[PDB]
Amino acid sequence: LLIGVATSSLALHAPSQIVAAIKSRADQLGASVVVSMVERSGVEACKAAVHNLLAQRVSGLIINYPLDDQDAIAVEAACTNVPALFLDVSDQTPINSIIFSHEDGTRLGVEHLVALGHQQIALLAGPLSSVSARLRLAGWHKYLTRNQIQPIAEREGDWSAMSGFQQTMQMLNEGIVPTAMLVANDQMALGAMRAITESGLRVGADISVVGYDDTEDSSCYIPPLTTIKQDFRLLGQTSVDRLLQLSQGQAVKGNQLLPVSLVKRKTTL
C-alpha cells in the first residue's frame, strides 16, 4: 500500500534509477511510494531518515543504503515490526536483502578481460565506506588471483564521474599505464574514458574500460561502455512484490541474490 524508500543520496544515477523503478512497479498495482533520502554517510544517517519515514506510517520499508553487517542489523532492529527490505548490504548479512551477485559481476569482468589477452589491469573502486564497493573490490581480487595476476594499480573514487577523471588521470601521470581498467560504476568510467582519451590514448584499442551497472546513460558514452548491467527494473519489481507477500506474512524469509550480465560494447578489444 504505502512504501517508504530510504536511499543513499539521489545524486548518483544508480539509486536515482532504483527509486524510479521501485515506483514503476508499485504503480503497476496502485501502491504508493514516498522516498526519503539519507544525509551522506553514517548509520545514524540511515536511521534518522528511516524514522522520518516510519513517521508517515509507511506500510513497509525498502532500505537502499550501503550498510555493513553490524549497522545494517541495527537499522532493521529499528525498522520496527514492519516489513523491511535491504538493497545495499552483503548477502552474508543475515536479514532481509536482495542484492546483485558481486561474485558474478566481478568474475565476468576479469573473465572477459583475461580472455581478451590483458595483463595490466588497473582497478578503480567505489569508496570503501560503501559495503557494495568493498565486495565489488574483493570481488575483482578473487578472480585476478584465481587467475594469478597482480593489478598494476588499484584505486578509490567516490562514484562521481570527476573522480574517474582526477584519479584515472593521475594513475597515468605516474607511468602506471594499464591496458585495461575495471571501473566500479559507469559514472566513474565516464571519467576514466575521458581521462584516457584526453591524455592521448584511443579508448578500447589502447586502454580498455569495463564499467559496472549499465546505468541508463551509458549506451551513449564515447565510445559506448562495455559494462556489467545490474537490472534495476527488477530490483525495482522483485523487491516491491517481495515486500508485498512479505507484508501479508507469506515469505520468503532471507536473502535473494540477483544475477548479472556483461553488456559487451565498444570499449573492450
Ligand X SMILES: C[C@H]1O[C@@H](Oc2ccccc2[N+](=O)[O-])[C@H](O)[C@@H](O)[C@H]1O
User: Does 187 participate in binding a copy of itself (rule CB under 8 A)?
Assistant: yes
Please pick, from the candidates 16, 96, 179, 227, the single residue that binds a copy of itself as defined by CB under 8 A.
16
Q: How far is the CB of 114 from a copy of itself (least distance, A)?
A: 27
From the CA atom positions of the chain, what is the Rg in Å?
A: 19
Q: Is 214 a binder of ligand X (CB under 6 A)?
A: no
Min dist. Cβ of residue 163 to a copy of itself (A)? 9
> What residues does 75 pair with on adjacent strands?
none
Does 19 bind a copy of itself (CB under 8 A)? Our answer is yes
Please count the other Cβ atoms lying within 10 Å of the Cβ belonging to residue 205: 11
Which set of grid coordinates corresponds to residue 2?
Answer: 504505502
220: contact with a copy of itself by CB under 8 A: yes
| Residues 53-82, mask of contacts with ligand X (x by CB under 6 A) | -----------x------------------
Give the shortest CB-268-to-a copy of itself separation in angstroms.
17
Alpha carbon distance 26, 147 (integer Å): 43
Ramachandran category for residue 54: left, alpha or beta (phi over 0 → left; psi -120 to 50 → alpha):
alpha
Please enumerate in sequence order all residues whose Cβ is within 8 A of that of 13, keeping only pairs 6 or more positions apart, or say none: 186, 187, 215, 216, 217
Name the H helices within 115-222.
Answer: 131-145, 161-166, 168-171, 186-198
* 8 Å CB contact between 206 and 181: no
109 binds a copy of itself, rule: CB under 8 A: no
As a whole number of angstroms, the distance between CA 64 and CA 191 comes to 25
Q: Does 99 bind ligand X (CB under 6 A)?
A: yes
Indicate whether 179 belongs to the interface with a copy of itself (CB under 8 A): no
- Give the helix/strand (H/E) hosting 245: helix 232-248
Alpha-helical (H) ranges within 28-173 are: 43-54, 69-78, 102-114, 131-145, 161-166, 168-171
Binding of a copy of itself by 101 (CB under 8 A): no
Q: Taking CB under 6 A as the criterion, which residues in 154-193 touch ligand X? A: 159, 185, 187
How many chain residues touch a copy of itself (CB under 8 A)? 42
C-alpha torsion angle, residues 45, 35, 239, 251 (rounded to 10): 80
Q: Should residue 238 be labelled a site residue for a copy of itself when binding is judged by CB under 8 A?
A: no
132 binds ligand X (CB under 6 A): yes
- Asked if 162 interacts with a copy of itself (CB under 8 A), we say yes
Residue 213, binding choice from a copy of itself, ligand X, none, Cβ under 5 to 8 Å by partner class: ligand X
Instruction: Say whether residue 100 binds ligand X (CB under 6 A).
Output: yes
**Counting contacts by CB under 8 A, is residue 52 touching a copy of itself?**
yes
Q: Residues interacting with a copy of itself, by CB under 8 A? A: 2, 9-11, 13, 16-17, 19-20, 23, 27, 32-37, 39, 52-53, 55-56, 160-162, 164-165, 187, 190-191, 193-194, 197-198, 216-217, 219-224
